[PDB]
Design a protein around this ligand. Structure first.
Ligand SMILES: Nc1ncnc2c1ncn2[C@@H]1O[C@H](COP(=O)(O)OP(=O)(O)O)[C@@H](O)[C@H]1O
Ligand SMILES: [Zn+2]
Length: 650
RNA sequence: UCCAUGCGCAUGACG
RNA sequence: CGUCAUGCGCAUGGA
């Protein structure tokens, strides 16, 4: 079987000639299948050539790899050729180079391939080359812009290509390089206020891929257009506690002589709070880092309240101050500052809570909007929002709300898996379960945070409602936008025209432009190398000291620290040990004699290790140069010794 | 299956 | 350059 649709046929035609073209098509056109056909044709040709045919397919997300190995490639070609569903998570007893030698076809993930190539350049002796393959295929090429995995990969291919040109002229023989296909929904357009900038961006993409031309369907376009149902665009749009909190912020400002130089509930105030916090850290002073941090917490509460039930802000600060109280209690087992701030809060805490019960509330507007939508439904919907906490708050509020229960439409939250912002990350398994549930109708509506926007298989949904999120199927579209669609349309128009412009270009001029872009990218990479190496020069054993940032006291030295796994830094020598405190709630966490959090107590190879984080400490060189904050160890060019387990045997 | 950690990347907003 | 929010990948250790 594997019959190929017509509009797919023409667009794929050039690649069958060895063309390293790009194929951009819309969503739902099943470019996976045309990709399969192309792979099949390339391999059959290499069979006729009596030469080995290798394909190494790449994706930026794992689940895509699983889907292609599950539903697309193996079904059609499993019996014809060897296929492997490679991924970083899937424990594979065998190393990558072997499967490079042992499988005719490969689904994979970019970073894995890059790591193998790095080992080739390194002394690990695990070797692979883009030349070793006969064909490289990529999905969502549009990510090949800025130091992305795809881009980092192709840059090597280019460099080699230019050497190949020089050798072609200088020498009759030249080394080989593979064909390159690239598939995307749309090449995309970045920060292009002009069709010229857009044209340049597109050309930069093509250069990164080194592709011959872009390809899109116009002749057979009507067939695909009718075949694919495409939704219509649309946009639809719908205190006292805040005042008290602002008053308290002003009270702290008066108590700290802190000038916001900015409005309330704005990013710039937070940015100033952080910069002031850094200055206080370098000054080793309190009510400066401390109160600045407290103010930042307050402004976070504000921005929460600006869109959210102030109950949630009360919960936010309930959590914050209760945990601070617990830290102080552990320390005890308080000064003018902490007492002032804590009491300044607790005094109004009950009143704030009472105010929180009073609705007098964007969320209340969205509730009415949503219920009105549900009356139309007769059943699938997707919410979106900026943050993770937002999704949980929405799900909690909707579940609590009786009206939505009366409607009988269930709802659940959904987020990514990155352990960031100290918020619970959903696991890939859990995400898969939830989307399966919604597809089955177990959950009528799914709250999301851009995870559902792409990758995850969500289709045939009546409505796609949004809640201040910058950005349906089954021939049913109920787009909503509560609180940039026009500007987005303008950009789409611009990129389409730029694409047509590039398609209608001289092959010579086009080749010259893309060649220049290739050279530029290579030069940028070389410059990046130059600066990156210069960063790591000092490599001092011990030229710094770790200090608590609330109480600017020496906490460690430069030499007492040791490294385990060449990842984690730790301080044995219990002179430090008697200082730090331990606390847990629900391996364990570490805190300060001042309540300042310090890190966690990891255990490696059986040694108990009070591991820590540079973020929560402030540097103090031996040269007495000003204090510093790095947010990560690698920023420091000096080198710490790997721990010797023979030492500290005890 | 879960936990914790390190590293890199892109996106949007903001300065 | 920094900030914040969001999403992704890789590599670890333990259970
Ligand atoms: N040659 C073909 N004939 C008929 N339908 C096809 C053909 N090739 C692809 N399709 C359709 O394309 C769909 C696959 O789309 P999919 O790959 O999931 O979307 P996308 O291309 O956006 O990833 C299949 O459901 C299939 O019906
Ligand atoms: Zn302290």
């Amino acid at each position: 079987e594997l019959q190929l649709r017509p509009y797919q046929m023409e667009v794929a035609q050039p690649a069958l000639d060895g063309k390293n073209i790009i194929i951009c098509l819309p969503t739902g056109s099943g470019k996976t299948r045309v990709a399969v056909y192309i792979t099949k044709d390339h391999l059959d040709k290499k069979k006729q050539a009596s030469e080995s045919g290798k394909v190494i397919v790449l994706v930026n997300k794992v689940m895509l790899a699983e889907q292609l190995f599950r539903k697309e490639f193996n079904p059609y070609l499993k019996k014809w050729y060897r296929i492997i569903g490679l991924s970083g998570d899937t424990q594979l007893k065998i190393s990558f180079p072997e499967v490079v030698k042992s499988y005719d076809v490969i689904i994979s993930t970019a970073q894995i391939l890059e790591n193998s190539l790095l080992n080739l350049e390194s002394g690990d002796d695990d070797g692979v080359q883009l030349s070793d393959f006969s064909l490289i295929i990529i999905d969502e090429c549009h990510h090949t812009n800025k130091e992305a995995v795809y881009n980092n990969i192709m840059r090597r291919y280019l460099k080699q290509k230019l050497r190949n040109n020089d050798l072609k002229k200088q020498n009759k023989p030249a080394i080989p390089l593979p064909q390159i296909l690239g598939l995307t929904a749309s090449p995309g357009v970045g920060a292009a206020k002009k069709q010229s900038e857009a044209e340049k961006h597109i050309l930069n993409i093509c250069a990164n891929l080194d592709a011959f031309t872009i390809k899109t369907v116009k002749e057979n376009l009507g067939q695909l257009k009718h075949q694919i149902k495409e939704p219509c665009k649309k946009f639809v749009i719908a205190n006292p506690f805040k005042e008290k909190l602002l008053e308290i912020m002003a009270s702290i400002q008066t108590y700290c002589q802190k000038s916001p130089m900015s409005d309330f509930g704005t990013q710039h105030y937070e940015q100033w709070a952080i910069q002031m916090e850094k200055k206080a850290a370098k000054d080793g002073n309190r009510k400066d880092r401390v109160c600045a941090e407290h103010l930042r917490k307050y402004n976070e509460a504000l921005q929460i309240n600006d869109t959210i039930r102030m109950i949630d802000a009360y919960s936010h600060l309930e959590t914050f101050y209760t945990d601070e109280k617990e830290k102080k209690f552990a320390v005890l087992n308080l000064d003018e500052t902490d007492e002032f701030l804590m009491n300044l809060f607790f005094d109004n805490k009950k009143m704030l809570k009472k105010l929180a019960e009073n609705p007098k509330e964007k969320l209340i507007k969205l509730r009415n909007t949503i219920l009105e939508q549900f009356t139309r439904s007769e059943s699938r919907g997707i919410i979106f929002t900026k943050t993770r906490q937002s999704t949980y708050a929405l799900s909690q509020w909707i579940m609590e709300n009786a009206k939505f229960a009366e409607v009988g439409v269930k709802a659940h939250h959904l987020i990514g898996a990155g352990h960031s912002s100290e918020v619970k990350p959903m696991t890939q398994t859990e995400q898969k379960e939830v989307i399966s549930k919604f597809r089955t109708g177990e959950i009528n509506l799914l709250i999301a945070t851009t995870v559902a926007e792409e990758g995850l298989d969500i289709k045939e949904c009546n409505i796609v409602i949004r809640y201040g999120l910058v950005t349906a199927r089954a021939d049913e579209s109920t787009y909503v936008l509560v609180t940039r669609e026009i500007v987005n349309d303008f950009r789409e128009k611009m990129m389409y025209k730029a694409i047509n412009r590039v398609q209608n270009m001289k092959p010579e001029e086009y080749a010259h432009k893309i060649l220049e872009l290739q050279v530029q990218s290579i030069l940028e990479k070389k410059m990046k190398v130059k600066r990156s190496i210069a960063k790591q020069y000092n490599d001092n054993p011990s030229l710094i000291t770790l200090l608590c940032k609330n109480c600017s006291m020496l906490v460690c030295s430069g030499e007492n620290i040791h490294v385990i796994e060449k990842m984690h830094h730790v301080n044995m020598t219990p002179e430090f040990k008697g200082l730090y405190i331990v606390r847990e709630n629900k391996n364990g966490e570490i805190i300060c004699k001042c309540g300042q959090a310090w890190g966690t107590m990891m255990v490696h190879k059986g040694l108990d290790l009070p591991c820590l984080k540079i973020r929560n400490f402030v540097v103090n060189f031996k040269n007495n140069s000003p204090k510093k904050q790095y947010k990560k160890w690698v920023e420091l060019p000096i080198r710490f010794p790997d721990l010797d387990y023979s030492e500290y045997c005890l």
